């Protein structure tokens, strides 16, 4: 059905590909050419995921796992049962994700709005492709990519992390961690501030943005603003994911020893590498 204000917005046009051919809705969902592609790659992927689960022997969703080729195949193709399906699913997964982002661009064009959302999304498509494509290719094998399985993708994280000692010491990991923590701080605050103005003390009239800006200033001496806080959230989360892909692209490629030891560059700086005392020497 339709939102009470929605009919006036469902005008033709804005499509990127195919004109009026797929310019329609199914229920609340806008289709478009790229709606069709998404559903295609999704349906394909799901089919192969269910297939893979047949060759594996289990229908339990907590055990289905699709594994990348062995390291022995390097970057070539592998038999479906011994690595090929991950290769296809990964193609479909990418299909579905890129079609999803393009489909959002079409929705943006119809609505007359900015493309900030599909732009932001693409940073996540970026991270995924880092893990399953850029890092493996640069390392010389698809075996270095994570497997599609609920708990088995978590075992990949432990074993990859622990190959380099405590992964905490990856300097880019550190920064990435920070942006993730701060984004959450920032969200909790924005969410609380809007709502504390919209829903004031009982019986009081709605506060204004003026009250919003006064609150932050009273509390920490500075208020970023109402446009600024949205600029800041978009920016914190995009950087968080950006440094994530960066922390993983350098791991195993340019740096492959233990991350804790990378920090010796600082301790061994020549003007103090040898003063005794402290922890080092």
């Amino acid at each position: 059905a339709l939102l009470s204000f929605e009919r006036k917005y469902r005008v033709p046009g804005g499509t990127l590909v195919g004109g009026n051919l797929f310019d329609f809705w199914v229920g609340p969902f806008y289709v478009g050419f790229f709606g069709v592609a998404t559903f295609f790659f999704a349906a394909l992927g799901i089919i192969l995921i269910a297939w893979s689960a047949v060759l594996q022997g289990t229908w339990n969703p907590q055990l289905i796992s699709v594994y990348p080729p062995a390291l022995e195949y390097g970057l070539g193709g592998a038999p479906l049962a011994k690595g090929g399906l991950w290769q296809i699913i990964t193609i479909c997964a990418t299909g579905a994700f890129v079609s999803w982002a393009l489909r959002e661009v079409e929705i943006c064009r119809k609505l007359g709005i900015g493309y900030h959302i599909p732009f932001a999304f693409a940073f996540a498509i970026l991270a995924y492709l880092t893990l399953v494509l850029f890092r493996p290719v640069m390392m010389g094998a698809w075996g270095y990519a994570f497997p599609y399985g609920i708990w088995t993708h978590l075992d990949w994280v432990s074993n990859t992390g622990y190959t380099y000692g405590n992964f905490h010491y990856n300097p880019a990991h550190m920064i990435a961690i920070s942006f993730f923590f701060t984004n959450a701080l920032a969200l909790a605050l924005h969410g609380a501030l809007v709502l504390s103005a919209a829903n004031p003390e009982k019986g009081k009239e709605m506060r204004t943005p003026d009250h919003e800006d006064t609150f932050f200033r009273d509390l920490v001496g500075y208020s970023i603003g109402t446009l600024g806080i949205h600029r800041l959230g978009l920016l914190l989360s995009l950087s968080a994911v950006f440094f994530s892909a960066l922390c993983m692209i350098i791991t195993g490629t340019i740096w492959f020893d233990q991350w804790v030891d990378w920090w010796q560059w600082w301790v061994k700086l020549p003007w103090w590498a040898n003063i005794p005392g402290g922890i080092n020497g």
Partner: protein, 300 residues
Amino acid sequence: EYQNIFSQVQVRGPADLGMTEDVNLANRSGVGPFSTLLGWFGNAQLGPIYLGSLGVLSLFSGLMWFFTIGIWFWYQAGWNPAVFLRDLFFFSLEPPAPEYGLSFAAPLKEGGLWLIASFFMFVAVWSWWGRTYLRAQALGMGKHTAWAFLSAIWLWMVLGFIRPILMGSWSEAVPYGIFSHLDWTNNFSLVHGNLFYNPFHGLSIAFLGSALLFAMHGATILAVSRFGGERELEQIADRGTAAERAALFVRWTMGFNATMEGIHRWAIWMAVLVTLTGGIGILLSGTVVDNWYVWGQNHG
């Protein structure tokens, strides 16, 4: 096209002393300067801050904590600046030995100093918490910030206070150091058998969720700032085309709906649930559950 990530032109007027309501105006600083640097991203006005009894208590108490730690870092450095700067990430102020259990008898040089710095942090944070409830109350606003803040306080209290007491010694608490608090984290997970099998860890991950939500939300309000959608409160009281088209992106893309106020309820809860669940995951770790791998094998 123009993307609205940085302001194009900056206007300035007289410094804004702010809404009065029931605030005690005798506790606001002079307006600080104006950062044209900051002006491209957000507001350019620094100050005025509000400092009263609790604000000083907090600020003072929090510096005391900060110094007690940093003193120790000079003791470890042999009072040598070169060393200090070299091993900065490596110094660490550690909790009392296990022997001292929960007593306050530990020598200064063996976690008596930790206990002092902890006490100061305990005053500073709880002071600051009462500060966030009272700054809102004086403006007539709901206390959503104090309650959301209480969620982070929850995790911190479990980590350094509630769980140590439940375990029976201060040694279970987090030390004060850069690299050393990192190793406590790795250590904790190993001892309890992979925190990855702690189901509360896993949800706390899912909520950390907030990157996605605030990516989407920030992206949207920018996408609809051509209709002044950043003005969210008056879009709540009198829905305009910004709120209508932002609802329709959500609805046409993935099928459900978000109101202008509604999405901030989504936002505050996504965020608070990170530390709310996480505190439960740590609290149960070692007090109730010794090995999360072993636990997941029976679910009991």
